[PDB]
Amino acid sequence: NDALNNIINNARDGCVPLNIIPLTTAAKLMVVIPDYNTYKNTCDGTTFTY
């Protein structure tokens, strides 16, 4: 509720696109990685930035 309230209060009409609700409020992320090169390119190490 906290980050959701923050991003809704930041909005003008109170309407935000649905595609950015998890982009800015979801606390857990899952990456599905088909092969090793994409693993080396998106989440190498123990921390990554998305």
Partner 1 sequence: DAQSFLNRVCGVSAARLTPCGTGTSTDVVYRAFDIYNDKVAGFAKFLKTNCCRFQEKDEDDNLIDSYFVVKRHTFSNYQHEETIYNLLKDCPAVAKHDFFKFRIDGDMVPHISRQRLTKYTMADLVYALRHFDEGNCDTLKEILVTYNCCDDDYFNKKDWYDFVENPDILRVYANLGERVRQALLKTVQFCDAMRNAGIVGVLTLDNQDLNGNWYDFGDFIQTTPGSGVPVVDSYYSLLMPILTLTRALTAESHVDTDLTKPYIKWDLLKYDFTEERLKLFDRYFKYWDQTYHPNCVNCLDDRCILHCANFNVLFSTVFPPTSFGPLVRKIFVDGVPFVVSTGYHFRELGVVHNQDVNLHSSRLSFKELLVYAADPAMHAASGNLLLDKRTTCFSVAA
Shortest distance, position 47 Cβ to partner 1, whole Å: 15
Which position among 18, 36, 46, 49 is part of the footprint of partner 1 (CB under 8 A)? 18
**Minimum CB distance to partner 1 smaller for 15 or for 45:** 15
Interface with partner 1, residue 1, by CB under 8 A: yes
Contacts of 50 (CB under 8 A, 6+ apart): 29, 31, 42, 43
Give the angle 9-23-13 at the CA atoms, nearest 5°: 30
Give the angle 3-45-50 at the CA atoms, nearest 5°: 35
Give me the residues that bind partner 1 (CB under 8 A), please: 1-2, 4-5, 7-34, 38, 42, 50
